[PDB]
Amino acid sequence: MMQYKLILNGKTLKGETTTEAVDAATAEKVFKQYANDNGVDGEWTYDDATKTFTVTE
């Protein structure tokens, strides 16, 4: 049950993407760097209940 829709928080920036990783920790470095690559800094948010990762600025 790896997530399939990575939802980025953006006011005028919207999209989704999907990739594979070796494990959750390995995916963390990529996902956080991808938020940084968008000019988004903030705490990482996750809901196991829905299997989604959101960046709370």
Place of tokens 């953006």: 10
- Give the CATH number of the domain where residue 12 resides: 3.10.20.10
Residue 1 lies in a domain: no
Total structural domains in the chain?
A: 1
Distance (Å, whole) CA 55 – CA 1: 20
Residue 39, in any domain of the structure? yes
Residue of 30, 9, 8 lying closest to 19 (CA atoms): 30
DSSP secondary structure string for all residues of 8-47? PP-SS---------SSHHHHHHHHHHHHHTTT--SEEEEE
Q: Is 22 left (phi over 0), alpha (psi -120 to 50) or beta?
A: alpha
Tally of residues, the chain:
57
For residue 34, the enclosing domain spans 6-56
